[PDB]
Design a protein that fits this description.
The structure is cut from a larger assembly and holds 8 protein chains of 8 kinds. By secondary structure, chain D is mostly helical. Chain D contains 2 helices and no strands. In chain F, 77% of the residues lie in helices and 0% in strands. Classes of the chains: A mainly alpha (347), B mainly alpha (171), C mainly alpha (98), D mainly alpha (120), E mainly alpha (115), F mainly alpha (139), G mainly alpha (99), H mainly alpha (175). The PDB classes it as electron transport.
Chain lengths: 347, 171, 98, 120, 115, 139, 99, 175
Amino acid sequence: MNPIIYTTLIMTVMSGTMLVMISSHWLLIWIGFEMNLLAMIPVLMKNFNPRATEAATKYFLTQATASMMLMMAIIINLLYSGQWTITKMFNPVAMTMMTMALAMKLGLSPFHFWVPEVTQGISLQAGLLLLTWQKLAPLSVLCQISQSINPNLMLTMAMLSILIGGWGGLNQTQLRKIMAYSSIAHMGWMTAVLPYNTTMTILNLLIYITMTLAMFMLLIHSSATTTLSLSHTWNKMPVITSLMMVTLLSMGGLPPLSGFMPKWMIIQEMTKNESIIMPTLMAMTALLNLYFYMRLAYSSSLTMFPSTNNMKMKWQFEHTKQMKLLPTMIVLSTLVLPMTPALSSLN
Amino acid sequence: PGIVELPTLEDLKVQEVKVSSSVLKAAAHHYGAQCDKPNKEFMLCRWEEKDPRRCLEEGKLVNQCALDFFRQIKRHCAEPFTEYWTCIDYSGLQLFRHCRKQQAKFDECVLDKLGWVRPDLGELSKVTKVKTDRPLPENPYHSRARPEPNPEAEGDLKPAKHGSRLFFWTM
Amino acid sequence: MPLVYMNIIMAFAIALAGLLMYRSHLMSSLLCLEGMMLSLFIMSTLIILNTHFTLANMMPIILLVFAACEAALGLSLLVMVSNTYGTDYVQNLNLLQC
Amino acid sequence: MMSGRPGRVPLQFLPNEARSLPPPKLTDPRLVYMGFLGYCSGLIDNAIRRRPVVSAGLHRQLLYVTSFVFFGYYLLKRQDYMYALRDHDMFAYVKSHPEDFPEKDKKTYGEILEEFHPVR
Amino acid sequence: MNIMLTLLTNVTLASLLVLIAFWLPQLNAYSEKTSPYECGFDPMGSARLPFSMKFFLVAITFLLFDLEIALLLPLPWASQTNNLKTMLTMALFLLILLAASLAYEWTQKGLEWAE
Amino acid sequence: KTLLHKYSDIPEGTECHRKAYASTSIGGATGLIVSAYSIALKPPASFLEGVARTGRYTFTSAAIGAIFGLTSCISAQVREKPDDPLNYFIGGCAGGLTLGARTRSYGIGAAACAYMGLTAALVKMGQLEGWQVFAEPKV
Amino acid sequence: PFFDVQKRLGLDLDRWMTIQSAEQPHKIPGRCHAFEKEWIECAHGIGGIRAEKECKIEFDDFVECLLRQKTMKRLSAIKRQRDKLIKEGKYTPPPHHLG
Amino acid sequence: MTMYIAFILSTIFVIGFVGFSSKPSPIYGGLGLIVSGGVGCGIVLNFGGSFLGLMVFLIYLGGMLVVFGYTTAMATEMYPEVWVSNKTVFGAFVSGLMMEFCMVYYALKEEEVEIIFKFNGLGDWVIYDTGDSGFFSEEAMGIAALYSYGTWLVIVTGWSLLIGVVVIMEITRGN
């Protein structure tokens, strides 16, 4: 891809997301979604392998189904209310239909099998983009319309995302798949906290965005895609694996690392809303995420693995890609807990 | 729940002026010139009250004045008006473009028989001021009492008592 | 809540069911998607024409505008699956399962 | 909680009124800790690039801590303003609704019948 | 009233002409008569196997081009507004963007057929 | 929700037949849901064996719900202890062993005893208290 | 909007189409302009949570005007009862109702 | 009779939808969508809208022609299927047709069906409004305001179309 073309496509993805997060008209929000979908496929197809074609397809048809469903909801709302403004749904059917219409975009419900597939098929950089930037728009729409959600549906969605993500992550050695399942689990956390206080949803989303950025760019700088290849990084470059394990402990949410602050704050919120079984359930089932986080950490830094002799030349040559914002990203990824009350800035 | 009040059939028993659309189109400009007061009063009543069940008397008076206008044109310029409206009626779109000679005959007839002049281009489309004597409807939309506005937020701001008050963070 | 709306909504429902079920090909699913789009256009047009929302008649035109764009992108995806696969069927599209 | 408060103007850090609050002190432990994050970010940056993590690129580390402190100051001012707004909306609503905030006819423990549990 | 009466007249007249064409002439059919025509000799055997079309890019961008004319066609009524400056700017915006799209395709092979 | 409400209308213990029927229907509904998901994600081979799979799942689930209902009502009536959480605990081992006896496994139903009975005790405790698994936004 | 840039810049991008009572081309009124105007002017600044309880009958009238079957159900039962009782000769329509 | 018209056209719309939703050969699915789009344009015409129906007509015929041109090129088989050839497509067609049959059956007798939404099916002539459009069609002034009012929509649609051509170029590049 011509670099200018790639820049324009990225700008169009960002412009679609911005149009979603700044427009009041429902049609304009859908137009932003459409621009995002339209510009996302070539980014995946950048490397042009059959894996990329497979993943880009599976991405497309799911998103297209979700967007058409979103139109069905918008049109029903207009029919029953006569308003395009993004305030609240005046027809229960329209909203209990858009809840999953906006869900396949996030990929949390049983509408989640597409996420690991697309993540594994496409390249790692576009995987970072898909798992970080492609979630602000539907989450923004959900935040705007959170006033009129059916809490039972949204909470069931969040529970299923958490449970299946944590369980599926236990049975993959490819980094892209277990990161997709981790993203599903974090989607479940944020979507669970969504109906009560959207500020905690924003805080968890920001923490997840920065921390997944740090994790993925560490993966890119390590040039690893399978567990064995990542384990081999210790001989060539040990500081990457050392930061890997700390960032994985943050993935699991072990305090005093940054990853606890959302998991903590979310639990503080819904227990204020008389919800006690749900926070305990999520707190216990995050251990499934933690298990494969520690499995990845064990065979990356905590136990040095059989290396390859040709790495004698690999140590001889340094890196060239700068990986901008990485050292800052690790810092906000591990130690921001003492500045927890700063979440009031979001509110 | 309520009453759909409807005036009885006696009030809307107007004389029901009977001329075809072509005849109306032929005398359009002169009628608009020499009948503007009843039309304007009736329409201002219609737009202000927003209730045709209320301004029926103006609907009577406009028809009375229209019938008076047509009676005058019958009494003074029957033949040129008849030929002009027939020639207008022949056209499918009822265009004034094809019928100009008959228009000239009609115009001169009404000018020297009833003291009329056709309005110039755009004269018949200017907003007029009526001197109606009815009151202004206080609640044309029959709107109910508006909900009281939310209590306004005001007052000087002081530092939050004991800082954030969020767990062990004192400051 | 009138009658024609029932028929258009029901047509959209069957088109949604048809999209969410594949049999062999990729073109058929795309056609079912554009049928969903057709039902959306007819429904929205009915709604706005009925309500005399004159400023909103552009909305079905913009619907069709992005409709054609998605159809084009989907069939280009099918071009690539045919180029790397010879055919367009979806059951043989399994290389990403593991 | 406050995204719908009347008078809010979107997309601007401090809404002018916040200057009536005491600005956070430059010594503030929250601020200096955010400066510490600036130092740490420099350490990873040198370590991530195979550099003498302590001595390498003094300017780069110096830029890191300075940048963190500046955004640290504005975040702290923004943080304190919201908490001040939370207290303002609280007490104003408390005063505006006396019936929903009853007062308690204060009495001492000598008249409270607090049951005692024998610890056996 | 009129339009479907018309359409019905055309379709029934056509279906009739088909009927007289297909039932009157007293056909006599055998297998080799209805055999596919392949310039004499028997066809190799296909007529439904994939037939490559090298203007697939051109064919698909026709869809976007013909789509834009939907935006373009309200112009005869759009000219009769009170904001001619904005209407002119937006119409020239559509036309300039179509020109840019066509030029991008022309320069980046695009309209040129595949081989 | 009304299908679940059928259990709610019948007081615990009394009207054991209606409660057993309601619990059997709960089990069967969950059974066809699980079997539908199973034949969706996991491909079957034909119609008759697909019926075999969904019938096995709905049979297991309907038996589980039925025996849970029967054990609950007969235990609450025989002991005159309707509020007893352990009333549901027999539904656990009944739910356990037969489930293992549905899979012809010993440890399966052995662990299912404790797991399902404990969860049954806590859900019953949801009736005893004012617990809300899906709490509406209050603060 | 999430990040309402439009109010910050004072620029209109989509607010013109949001409601039926806005300035339509050539001042063409909406079918339910009056009801929408009354409902909107009712619950403005009052709060989107107080709107449901306070401005209820206004929104009910507006939604009726949009869909109209507390009126069309009236018509349907009127027609049903008419066709019912006319069948066995209880009522005959007046001449003005069939020509 | 001419009383309903819109009802019958909606039934043909649904039947055309069933035709291509049954996953037949893509040419036959295109034909089914063609008849569905034509009768939908008829419905929009009968509901006081002329430009919108003809726009659906033209745009969808262009799109479906390109779908055909791709179908016989890429998405074809040595044995194209019919709505009666395979038992799966026959089953889908049967399910759709009998379904819509029983939906319209439950609809046009009781005329008070609750399904999803309350559907009081008296007649589509009822909901029409007594109005006066003067010397301008409302739909014409409506879609003519795109260049005067909806400037933002103009910008976003043009940008989306240009970048759609860009992506149609990039996806089909093939190394």
